[PDB]
Design a protein around this nucleic acid. Structure first.
Lengths: 148, 125, 534, 57, 63, 113
RNA sequence: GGUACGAAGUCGAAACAAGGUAGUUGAUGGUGAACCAGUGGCUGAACAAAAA
RNA sequence: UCUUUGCCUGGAGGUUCGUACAGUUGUAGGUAAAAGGUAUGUUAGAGACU
RNA sequence: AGUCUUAAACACACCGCUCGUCACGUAACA
């Protein structure tokens, strides 16, 4: 049962429109094709702890450990623009204060529910990528990489 | 004249696409001049109210500052030789109301006729 | 119920329905949407919507269309101009028959058959717009969202980048109305694969769907939903170079499906529609109809010949001869202008693909020049001959009056439509309708010119002010904006140092007068009063 | 200037320079490359050269 | 010596509203005669006359 | 974790919570003020210094940082740290000529350029 | 009679925090000095405070 | 963003129809901080519990 | 006794803060 207020206005989502996804993939593919041609290219796959389906290593390069004293919005990935050249964030909502002034392209993959409620993530994300079914990124990218 | 000053509040919005405006004879003529300069994407008279679109570029809107000079309680008039001193070394847009219709400040000096400063667009101090 | 079921519909999908026509609610100055041409202020893009009560493209629409196209083309910021329409299930009708009825009775009223100034003023305007779209210096994207009736596809076929979709159609039946195709329509028909244009004009076969792009008319299949999106991401086009701009626009073009109705019938059209004479092909179709129907292939061919003949017997025999003579005349030119250079079949195929993709290599870039050179020459000849046959037909053919009224009255209701008898077929030289015409005063050589032909129809004296010659010429339009400050005039390419100006006041004075609706209304009104009173 | 001109789509030039940001010569249409193998084919198809407006050419 | 500049004809298919179109068309004719009508001495007419003319008609180019 | 500075030739901390990509030999700092605060505790009073240091390139960059420290010398260094991390781009004319004069406000203030 | 400033003595513990057993205010009464009793209004009001 | 009414300029102070009607902040001897408030600490015969 | 919550005109922080009558002296509106 539910005793709360029933909403009346239904907001529309144009960022994740079915037709808009056509150009999103086409434009994104061109950028990746040119980058892989060059030698010595490395990427970064940043996720979340809840993502059990995605295996993670023990150590992480570029990770900085800081203390509570004098930590006014310290940038964790400050030195992550030397060794890496492309970061694919999976939780832009959580990683929003650190990627505000990052000097690397961010391939964030958010969901329409978070985009509408948290539009601030649009400024930090450079190349927007859609996410069909928009439920859990852990099992979302696995299907795409294992098609047919 | 009162309805003319009510257009600045609606057109001066950041997080918006289209805003309504009361219908008026003088208001319709003003929108024509702004569209020529490329400040308004478009407008449509929806009967009792006029729907005017907003133009944006790289997030920020094209309009950043609006100054109302003329008011219903008084009337500002400047001679052809005095308007140049007021308006100098600037990129602003001043709406001039002359006898032969409504024109911008650039055209008022060309004809040399005494206009009337209504409002300012993209103006500093 | 299940999501995977065949008959499954999402309630949310039907809740977000929108009217595509309402998307163009906002326009340029003027709250009341009644202008024949509209424009929307965009960054790096030029919007142009053709809105009309019934898609009637009269002189009023052409005057506005020419100004907007030139204003946007000269602007360097606008790297490309897009065209579209606003009518529901309709497109540019292209000089509807209602306007032609007045030009026929007035011209044939006088004994001398002197063409008035109004008749020639409107006809010459149609050629200017047709040449501008083909010779556009920037890409011209256009989509046929509505159905085309009669000769009204000149604004999409002649465009630099033509597109189509499922909600499109192609209808062209000039023989039924007894009128020659205008707006340089013969150029596209003669450039089709094989003799497809001849069959599509004499019979007037209708085509819709993917067949348009597969036939050769269009070259893109962009969806209507792409145009609104272009207005939102147009600020990133000026950052890249000129060549890189065209690459981004290629992401909107989709693929074409496998579907064609004339896959096997194309060979029959070329075999039959091949005689240089109209009277010769008549026996060819009749012979096939009486052919002994045998096997499976013979059965289909026998019915095809019997059905096609019925349509040609309900048109004007004289009209069919004029259209066929002009379409084939320009077509034969391509076989000689390109063959004399020494080109092979294999080489020509590669050149055709240059228009469907942007060249990048030096070898590929050179091929594009050849296609542009031949195309520019063919259109000039087709338009020049098209005007010659248009003026003579209106002053000699008397059966054109009945056809114009029959179709005009039938639009409101079929009950008012009547089939006229046209006229009995007669032999003709099919050469007198393509003779050059000039208006030159020197006649010391025993009537060297003597107006159009030696004893043909003459033009009014008032037509010696704007157009010194009746022939359709090409004007050297500028490609950069003008200026008034002395410092800016020095940067314009066409800026002579002997006068300090970037334009000729005398030449530009007449150009503005020609493109003026207010001046034309007064001239048209004066002629109407004279005809009604006496 | 570069900001206002992009949206204003109007003359937004300075006093000293002349049309620096708006002037965009067609560098991919006029200076197009031409080879000697295909030049002979376009001579008989293009308009013959009969003009007098350029001395330093 | 003077140098009267030519004036372009107003466009008939103006996209502006009817109220502005009529005013613009009339204003074009005023400019033409403004540069081709030298004004007389100041002493000719009254002071009052001058003030009204300035706010009703453009300024001539041949004072 | 060091970077050479060939005309000086001495070890300097590279990262220390600072982007190594950004050259540190191209920026300048300007001390504004060194304010002093007071804190009360159970025994007596505790004083901690503070400073506001603005760091930004003199071409197209500007920034203001604020921090705290136990001593004036340490406060200055900490304040400068925030300025670097909060560097923002400006919209400046190529020709070195503004369009219109800007005006600025926060409570009583006015800074007319 | 009343008021200002400087110095400073005696007689009292009114305001702060529910101890003066809440405390400012409009109009009266009363008392060597904090001001006190009653009615109206306010919070610039403390403690305490529900299932079948 | 626009029309019109009303009101204030740090704090602060005054002799020891006619005893009626009307009307009132202002001409000083003196002073340089009255005061809104986010946070910390302390006090509390003010509430609760290892 | 050690914490938590709330209030405060004190923060050399309750040995805090602050008011009134009377006594003496110097003055401006008398």
């Amino acid at each position: 049962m539910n005793f709360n207020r029933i909403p009346t206005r239904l907001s529309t989502h144009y960022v994740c429109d079915p037709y808009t996804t056509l150009m999103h993939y086409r434009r994104t593919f061109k950028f990746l094709q040119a980058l892989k041609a060059k030698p010595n290219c490395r990427a970064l796959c940043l996720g979340n702890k809840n993502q059990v389906n995605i295996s993670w290593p023990k150590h992480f390069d570029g990770l900085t450990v800081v203390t509570s004293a004098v930590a006014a919005q310290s940038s964790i990935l400050s030195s992550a623009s030397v060794y890496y050249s492309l970061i694919i964030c999976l939780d832009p909502v959580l990683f929003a204060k650190h990627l505000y002034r990052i000097n690397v392209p961010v391939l964030g993959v958010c969901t329409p529910r978070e985009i509408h409620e948290h539009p601030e993530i649009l400024k930090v994300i450079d190349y927007l990528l859609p996410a069909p079914c928009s439920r859990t990124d852990a099992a979302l990218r696995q299907l795409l990489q294992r098609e047919f | 004249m009162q309805r003319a000053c009510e257009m600045v509040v609606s057109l001066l919005r950041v997080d918006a696409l289209s805003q309504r405006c009361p219908f008026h004879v003088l208001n319709v003529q003003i929108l024509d001049l702004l569209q020529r300069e490329g400040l308004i994407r478009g407008f449509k008279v929806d009967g009792t109210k006029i729907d005017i679109l907003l133009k944006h570029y790289k997030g920020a809107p094209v309009i950043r500052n609006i100054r109302v000079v003329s008011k219903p309680s008084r009337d500002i008039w400047l001679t052809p030789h005095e308007l140049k001193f007021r308006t100098r070394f600037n990129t602003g847009l001043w709406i001039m109301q002359t006898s032969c219709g409504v024109i911008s400040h650039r055209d008022c000096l060309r004809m040399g006729i005494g206009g009337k400063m209504l409002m300012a667009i993209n103006n500093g101090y | 119920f299940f999501r995977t079921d065949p008959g499954f519909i999402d309630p949310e999908d039907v809740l977000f329905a929108e009217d595509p026509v309402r998307t163009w609610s906002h326009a340029d100055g003027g709250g009341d949407l009644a202008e024949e041409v509209l424009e929307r202020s965009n960054v790096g893009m030029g919007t142009c919507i053709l809105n009309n009560a019934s898609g009637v493209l009269n002189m009023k629409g052409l005057c506005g269309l020419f100004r907007k196209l030139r204003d946007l083309e000269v602007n360097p910021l606008k790297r490309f101009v897009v065209l579209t329409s606003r009518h529901r299930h309709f497109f540019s009708t292209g000089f509807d028959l209602k306007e032609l009825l007045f030009l026929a009775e007035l011209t044939q009223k006088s004994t001398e058959k002197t063409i008035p100034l109004v008749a020639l003023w409107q006809l010459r305007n149609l050629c200017d717009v047709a040449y501008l779209v083909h010779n556009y210096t920037k890409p011209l994207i256009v989509l046929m969202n509505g159905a085309t009736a009669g000769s009204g596809a000149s604004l999409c076929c002649l465009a630099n980048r033509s597109a189509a979709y499922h909600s499109s159609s192609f209808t062209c039946d000039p023989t039924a109305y007894g009128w020659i195709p205008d707006s340089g329509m013969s150029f596209v028909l003669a450039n089709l694969r094989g003799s497809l244009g001849v069959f599509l004009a004499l019979t007037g076969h209708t085509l819709s769907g993917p067949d348009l792009i597969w036939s050769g008319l269009c070259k893109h299949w962009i969806s209507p939903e792409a145009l609104p999106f272009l207005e939102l991401t147009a600020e990133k086009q000026l950052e890249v170079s000129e060549r890189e701009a065209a690459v981004l626009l290629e992401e909107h073009f989709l693929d074409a499906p496998d579907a064609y109705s004339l896959d096997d019938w194309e060979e029959v059209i070329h075999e039959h529609f091949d005689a240089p004479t109209v009277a010769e092909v008549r026996a060819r179709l009749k012979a096939t109809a009486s052919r002994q129907s045998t096997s499976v292939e013979g059965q289909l061919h026998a019915a095809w010949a019997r059905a096609v003949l019925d349509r040609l017997a309900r048109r004007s025999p004289l009209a069919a001869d004029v259209t066929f003579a002009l379409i084939r005349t320009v077509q034969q030119l391509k076989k000689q202008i390109i063959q004399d250079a020494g080109i092979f079949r294999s080489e020509w195929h590669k050149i055709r693909r240059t228009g469907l993709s942007v060249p990048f290599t030096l070898q590929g870039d050179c091929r594009k020049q050849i296609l542009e050179a031949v195309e520019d020459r063919l259109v000039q000849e087709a338009l020049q001959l098209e005007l010659r046959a248009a003026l003579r037909l209106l002053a000699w053919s008397t059966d054109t009056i009945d056809g114009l009224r029959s179709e005009c009255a039938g639009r409101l209701n079929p009950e008012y439509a009547y089939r006229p008898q046209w006229k009995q077929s007669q032999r003709f030289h099919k050469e007198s309708y393509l003779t050059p015409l000039q208006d030159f005063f020197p006649t010391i050589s025993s009537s060297r010119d003597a107006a159009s032909h030696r004893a043909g129809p003459h033009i009014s004296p008032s037509c010696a002010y704007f157009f010194p010659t009746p022939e359709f010429t090409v004007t050297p339009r500028t490609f950069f904006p003008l200026s008034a400050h002395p410092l800016i005039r020095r940067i314009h390419p066409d800026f002579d140092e002997e006068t300090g100006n970037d334009h000729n006041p005398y030449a530009m004075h007449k150009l503005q007068m020609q493109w003026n609706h207010s001046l034309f209304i007064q001239e048209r009104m004066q002629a109407l009063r004279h005809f009604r009173n006496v | 200037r570069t900001l206002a001109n992009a949206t204003g789509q109007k003359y937004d030039l300075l006093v000293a320079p002349g049309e620096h940001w708006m002037h965009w010569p067609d560098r991919w249409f006029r200076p197009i490359s031409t080879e000697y193998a295909r030049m002979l084919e376009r001579i008989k198809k293009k308009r013959p050269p009969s003009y007098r407006r350029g001395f330093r050419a | 010596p003077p140098t009267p500049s030519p004036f372009p004809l107003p466009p008939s298919p103006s996209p502006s509203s009817p109220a502005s179109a009529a005013a613009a068309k009339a204003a074009a004719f005023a400019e033409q005669a403004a540069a081709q009508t030298p004004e007389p001495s100041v002493l000719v007419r009254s002071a009052e006359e001058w003030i009204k003319r300035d706010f009703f008609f453009p300024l001539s180019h041949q004072p | 974790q060091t970077v050479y500075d060939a005309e000086k030739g001495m070890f300097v901390r590279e990262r220390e919570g600072v982007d190594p990509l950004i050259k540190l030999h191209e920026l300048r700092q300007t001390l504004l003020s060194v304010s002093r605060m007071m804190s009360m505790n159970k025994q007596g009073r505790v004083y901690y210094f503070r400073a506001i240091v603005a760091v930004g390139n003199g071409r197209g960059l500007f920034g203001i940082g604020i921090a705290f420290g136990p001593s004036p010398k340490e406060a200055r260094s900490n304040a400068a740290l925030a300025a670097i991390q909060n560097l923002d781009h400006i919209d400046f004319d190529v020709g070195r000529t503004l369009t219109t004069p800007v005006h600025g406000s926060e409570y009583s203030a006015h800074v007319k350029i």
